[PDB]
């Protein structure tokens, strides 16, 4: 007898004994239960007080080596209760079995605590079912910070916000430790995260199996557990997610991709080296970053990462953030048909096929699209299947597969005598496509950040050459640094304006960064090649290829703003 | 019997009755007592939890019209116990007497609460002496946010930090109100602040008088109470101090100083209008802003305010933030002899005398300073007495009063034929001065922010003239806007770098803003005067007067940074 009543008397014997001991037949508790773990119904100070209170009640209930046995039992239960193939689960179990290390609550979450009706203090704790290590429960509580950005959150809640009032993981860890007495640093933390994620995956699989007599969430959980199983999680105190991702990006870059620059350049005059690097980056978790949902970071962190990966010429290819593909990916994901999404994006997010965005025709109503394209970047790749054309309120963009009859590449276009193997013309002669086959802010931001990174590398090279081999060169260096700093500041300001105050109130800054950057970057490239009297050739080629209506647009917007202000 | 024991049994009868009723002879309480109200011994979440807990214990002890009589009694007690002349106290009492509107604790502060030894929860509340309105106690608790930036904090603590973890005043107000049930908005809040400040001043005066049988703190408290007695304090929820100061600056500007522009310009070809405006600004509290201790704001708020007050040509004169005076004031305040400070700064902070910083000689050891100055700005003012000269590690700056024998102005220097009534040469022929009479970051930041504001006003004027009367003018407008945005971003970045990561790690950005701004601002002025084919004459004069070694310095620093990075 433990069901609801209008609680009950309530291995129920173990739970009853635990309740009796704690008191040294529980009735109803008149308190709240935050289903969503983001706590959106209170202020910031209230959220911080709530999390401090749960930390201290955990400490008070804890402070007042069969862990491997528990891991083995959970592995056996998950393997016996499994109903679908899951190599990730077996890999995670094998990896955790290679790692070794009281009265816990088993499933201590924010959803199993009833507070006071008018005050933020813990009144009672329930659901003490799987109770039998003084640090595993803390890891189970704190794992929700690393809930995968792709998997929807459990208990119908939003992902944990940052800079809102919630304590960061290190902050909560320090609170609990100082409440207990142990040192802030903790050992075998990767093992704790792996065990917690594996236990959660097993619980979800068991719940799904019981409901059959949650199902698709075991694979993302196992993948994330494997991803965090090989890292250095600093328990002691030290967006934060953006900084961690940027640090990992820099480490991966400096450890793998810079030494391959010479080999790639020699092969230029896609190699299997790029394929191996792509596989390594996908395995390490650094893949499809630029997608604003598969990675979860904010716009400013995106711009900083793009700046960090614009230095190498072919760097965006490794992270699957090429120039044409990302716009089509964003268009498909944001406002796209579910059937069209399943048909097309699945061949993009896995890197199966490329894409192309072309507007440099007739889209008259099925519908027929007869016209001639031009300057279509990335149209010559052997793995280029999809194609998005926004041709003639005549703006109607419709997908057109390149394998459809009537599509035929005409000739390759050369810029300054470089074929750009890493601009073939396209002709569409009355292609028949079904009706099923039928913004710029992030694109401009990333296209400016990459150019800024390129200019920074150019300045580094020019400074090194000037030192290795007068006042004029020093003046050139100083002017280049000034221009680089100003352009970076403008780009970051535009990105932050897009992030905070919507996306429709940042057209002015986008036009401004579209105007400012290329001129100064071309000037810097010219000064560098003049000082030289080498990778700089590729940088100059890119800067010249990437090189006055936007000034008129900015003037119109400025005049409108001045008229509005008065 | 209420003294300490190793508490006691403990109008003590009223306190004993209150304790007995609350329980329905208190012993010692084993808990902490935060003397400093900033709570520096805990983390951010712990601070937020502490303040939430004090808010809810206040609400629980309160929720579970003799206010004018109490005000009159406090006024009588303060007047009878007064020992020194205080017109501010009488003025505040008269102002409060014109404003009209349970079981309180009288002196409910963070210093009269004992928490738990290991948890952040309220255990007991003490010092219930003056207990007899359900909102006055809240105002007394929350007044500590407006502790004057000049008066040192009480109970030997630091001023309340921002963006640290402490709740903002509106946030705490909302917490307490939602705990009680009243609406977030509150009436007669200015009266509450005035009464709270007057009561605190009376308590301090009484404590000082009792100790004589705190003394100098009654005047700043009364002045601050008078200053906040005339404002609009929004109780409901809506740096914050920087934003409030900037809003007040903009309101004062647009309400008083812009209409006087025509009169001042006509008088040009200091008037009593400037004196009246200076008196009004000093009365309103907007005075000596640029001093980094008499105002208390951070560097970024300082730059934003300076940008807002750089638009009017003579605006810095009203706020007492002139170009030469502020450097000498900062040098005196930061590292200056107490005797020298009392001798000189007191004639500056009150606007009694001006100053001048001149280095464009011999300071050989008393000491004699014989040499010829040049381009000494502000040396012709009739109220110019002090003078700081850093002349010949020969850098030894020594104050030299201008009334001393041997100092005589030579001739006035004209720039472009403007005498600049709002540059006389100085000659020092063996001045005898005692040995008693013996950085650039804020100066450069403000000197760039004012120029940015001037450029913004110039662009506004040029846009208005272009509308009132082609593609080239539109292109000019767009380029001017781009340059203005880039320069503002650079200036703010340099100011923030000075603020956060010390003042010795921002020389590069300071040199960068010293290089970048004048060229673009001069170009904008040239384009404006070309479009015109008027206040713009004064703006061009200033921009030209304010107009290549810094490039070499920046190149040297950049080369050193590149060498260090490798
Ligand atoms: C490296 C590279 C990659 C490219 N990739 C792509 C791609 O992926 N997809 C794609 O669709 N296109 C692509 N393009 C083409 C790109 O769209 C063109 O550079 C651009 O659209 C101009 O094409 P256009 O010949 O129509 O310009 P035109 O209209 O022929 O050029 C007119 C020029 O005159 C000037 N001008 C315009 N209006 C005014 C005015 N009112 N007053 C004064 N001057 C004015 C401007 O300088 C303007 O560029 C690429 C080009 C390059 C060089
Ligand atoms: C409006 C105004 C207000 C002023 N107010 C003050 C004031 O309050 N206090 C004060 O002390 N002074 C003041 N001055 C003077 C100011 O210090 C001077 O403008 C400046 O110091 C230059 O003086 P100078 O004659 O010694 O320069 P000079 O040394 O005679 O000029 C040399 C010039 O050559 C160039 N140059 C220098 N080194 C190099 C190099 N290595 N390579 C190439 N070119 C180089 C630079 O353009 C430099 O300005 C003011 C000036 C003006 C115009």
Residue numbers in the entry:
A (entry chain C), B (entry chain A): 54 to 59, 66 to 69, 81 to 94, 118 to 157, 172 to 208, 215 to 245, 248 to 328, 339 to 363, ...
From the study:
Unlike other ACADs, ACAD10 and ACAD11 feature kinase domains that phosphorylate the 4-hydroxy position as a requisite step in converting 4-hydroxyacyl-CoAs into conventional 2-enoyl-CoAs.
In the second mutant (A*), we replaced the catalytic aspartate of the ACAD domain with asparagine, eliminating the ACAD activity but leaving kinase activity intact. To further explore the bifunctionality of ACAD10/11 at the molecular level, we initiated cryo-electron microscopy (cryo-EM) experiments with the ACAD11 K* and A* mutant proteins purified from Escherichia coli. To assess whether substrate interactions affect protein structure, these mutants were incubated with 4-HV-CoA and 4-PV-CoA, respectively, before preparation. a, Cryo-EM map and model of the ACAD11 A* mutant tetramer incubated with 4-PV-CoA. To explore how the kinase domain might bind an acyl-CoA substrate, we modeled 4-hydroxyoctanoyl-CoA (4-HO-CoA) in the ACAD11 A* kinase domain’s active site pocket. We observed that a substantial portion of the CoA moiety associated with residues inside a cavity adjacent to the active site opening.
